[PDB]
């Protein structure tokens, strides 16, 4: 790793003097998500739909 | 954003109200007493019938409540409560909602879970207005439309707060979670012993079956045809249903009793020994619910595509319908109606068998991540209790639960579907997962009487 | 958000039980 | 098809995992089921009355309430 | 109105009786029993003035 990151993050440092005790701490599948969401919200709403239907 | 959305429903979660804490720790006999009063109040509160009913044929109302639970007051149930509750831990699984670990955090977590589920009441009623399934809204009037609502809001209400005083700790266990049991053991004897006689074409016949029984018996000379009769019924409930039904809950009662337990002490005080369990049905039954939940959705949808574009390749080819999709994969996923037609066509009944197992033992895994209870959860919870395991360090501790963690909920997912899918087959009266609730409910009751006793 | 004993709860249950037969037996001497 | 065989490789493993969690896990013994059975079996049978009379009770109000 | 209203007074006047009823034997039973410890303080202001 480049020496030259030493000073850089030095100076970020420098810079906590004015953002005192406010400092920035730091510095699930996408298809399942998506997946169980309409399965949950798929039941209620279909549940709603079915007893129309089953009453027409 | 959600903790932003937090202290804007904070006002709105003030209103609810809250049990009282229970001052001191009650001695059995007065334990047992608060569950029961609330068990009668609830269960009579289901039967009641509603008013402003209407109804062509007069009268069709009332014949309607002599039979199933169709138009009472409780109509609407625990059914509201439990999807808020789903829908909430999800959330939290996604992390999209965002809950503080801090006390009063979560305390408001559990006012807004309550709150939404108030919400989820109110549409459901107003929807079954609308939809004139009660009658014509026009014909009902304004006032009597509002104060069907209001029956069924206060329903509702009454549910939460009897839920509550359960948690509380004035009666044992959650209220809930015994209302679920007590209408699936009254289904089995209900069947069992029903002495209501109903008129078939042919003859009227007694609804209960050893009332069948004895009945036909007598009314007949011949013995062995009689005998026939009353154990392979096809039209009302058979001899033989009851006797699937004792098997299935021996079956139950045994693996239930599966678990594997692990060593923990507590860090601050010696000579203490815990064991942490983990249950075989780690996960449940929320698997099975979420695999029937995709299957009905899939087939409503399928259904409803039909009608509106019939002439689409693409609706017929996944399912053909006639509503029982005769052909295509939904009509793969529905169950085989009977023995003779899986001997028929045993790729179908194949097909939905491999099926069945591989859905539940998938979506029991994935849902561990998203339920908050997977080994890294574990881990944390344990330290802030500040009990850790015996001879490994604390990073260790997180690679051995993950040992047995994983494996048991892929098991457990299994577990649970091959019992349902045998609970049919047998023909036993109740759902499978239904059994599984009642000896689980049971036994834990039962835990708390052993010290009880001491 | 008042902190309610359980003993109140368990009377406030019950008039809203008594309230449903009043409500049936008054809509029949009302029609009648 | 390829999928499928490299999927048949994971098949076998866990079937091997399945096993070694079973022989872990403590196993009722007959003598504690007993117990369990008895004590399950008059849960069921008393809650299960409970509302089995009072449904039945129900049924003749049903008829007073509304004609 | 006494022809309409009179089964109403009846159907109501019973549960606000009972409510009433209630509340008194409520209130009596939950008569507070005098804390014995502040008792024993009154006996020890009593061996003062003695």
């Known amino acids: 790793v480049a020496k030259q990151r030493i000073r850089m993050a030095n100076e970020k440092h420098s810079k906590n003097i004015t953002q005192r005790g406010n400092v920035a701490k730091t510095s699930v599948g996408p298809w399942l998500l998506a997946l169980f969401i309409f399965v949950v919200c798929g039941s209620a709403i279909f549940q709603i739909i079915q007893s129309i239907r089953m009453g027409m | 954003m959600a903790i932003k959305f937090l202290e804007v429903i904070k006002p709105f979660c003030v209103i609810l109200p809250e049990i009282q804490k229970p001052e001191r720790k009650i001695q059995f006999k007065e334990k047992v007493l608060w569950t029961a009063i609330t068990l009668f109040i609830f269960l009579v509160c289901c039967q009641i019938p509603l008013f402003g009913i209407m109804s062509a044929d007069p009268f069709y109302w009332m014949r309607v409540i002599l039979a199933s639970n169709r138009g009472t007051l409780m109509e609407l149930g625990i059914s509201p409560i439990v999807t808020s509750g789903l829908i909430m831990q999800l959330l939290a699984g996604a992390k999209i909602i965002e809950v503080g670990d801090t006390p009063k955090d979560r305390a408001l977590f559990n006012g807004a879970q309550k709150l939404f589920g108030m919400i989820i009441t109110i549409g ?3 929807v079954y207005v609308m939809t004139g399934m009660y009658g014509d809204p026009s014909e009902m009037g304004a006032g009597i439309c509002l104060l069907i609502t209001i029956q069924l809001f206060v329903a509702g209400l ?71 009769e009353a154990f392979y019924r096809q039209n009302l409930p058979n001899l033989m249903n009851l006797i699937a039904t004792i098997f299935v809950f021996a079956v139950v009662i045994y693996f239930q009793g599966f678990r594997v337990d692990l060593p923990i002490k507590s860090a601050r005080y010696r000579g203490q020994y815990n064991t942490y369990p983990i249950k075989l049905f780690y996960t449940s039954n929320i698997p099975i619910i979420l695999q029937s939940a995709l299957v009905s959705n899939l087939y409503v949808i399928s259904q409803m595509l039909s009608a509106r574009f019939s002439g689409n390749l693409l609706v017929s080819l996944l399912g053909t319908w006639s509503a029982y999709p005769v052909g295509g994969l939904c009509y793969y996923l529905s169950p085989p109606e009977s023995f003779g037609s899986v001997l028929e066509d045993p790729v179908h009944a194949v097909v939905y068998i491999v099926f069945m197992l591989g859905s539940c033992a998938f ?53 649970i579907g091959a019992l349902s899918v045998l609970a049919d087959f047998l023909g036993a009266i109740g759902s499978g997962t239904g059994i599984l609730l009642a000896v689980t409910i049971i036994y834990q009751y039962f835990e708390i009487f052993v010290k009880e006793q001491s | 958000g008042l902190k309610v004993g359980p003993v109140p709860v368990l009377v406030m249950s019950l008039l809203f039980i008594a309230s449903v037969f009043m409500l049936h037996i008054w809509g029949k001497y009302t029609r009648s | 098809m390829d999928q499928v065989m490299q999927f048949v490789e994971p098949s076998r493993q866990f079937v091997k995992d399945s096993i070694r969690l079973v022989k872990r896990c403590t196993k009722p013994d007959r003598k504690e089921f007993q117990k369990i059975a008895m004590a399950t079996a008059i849960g069921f049978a008393i809650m299960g009355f409970i509302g089995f009379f009072v449904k039945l009770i129900h049924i003749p109000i049903n008829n007073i309430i509304v004609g | 109105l006494v022809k309409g209203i009179l089964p109403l007074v009846g159907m109501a006047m019973v549960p606000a009786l009972l409510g009433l009823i209630g509340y008194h034997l409520y209130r009596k039973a939950n008569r507070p029993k005098v804390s014995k410890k502040k008792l024993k303080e009154e006996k020890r202001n009593k061996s003062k003035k003695k």
């Open chain 2, 124 to 126: 459901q009623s107003i």
């Open chain 2, 158 to 228: 009454i549910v939460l707060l009897l839920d509550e005083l359960l948690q509380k700790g004035y009666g044992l266990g959650s209220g809930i979670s015994l209302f679920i049991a007590t209408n699936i053991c009254e289904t089995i004897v209900w069947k069992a012993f029903s002495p209501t006689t109903v008129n078939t074409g042919r003859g009227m016949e007694f609804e209960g079956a050893i009332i069948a029984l004895f009945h036909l018996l007598a009314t007949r000379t011949d013995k062995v045809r009689a005998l026939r």
């Open chain 2, 363 to 415: 979506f029991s895994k994935t849902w561990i991540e998203v339920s908050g209870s997977s080994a890294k959860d574990v881990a944390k919870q344990l330290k802030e209790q500040q009990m850790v395991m015996r001879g490994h360090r604390e990073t260790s501790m997180v690679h051995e639960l993950n040992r047995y963690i994983p494996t048991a909920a892929a098991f457990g997912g299994l577990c």
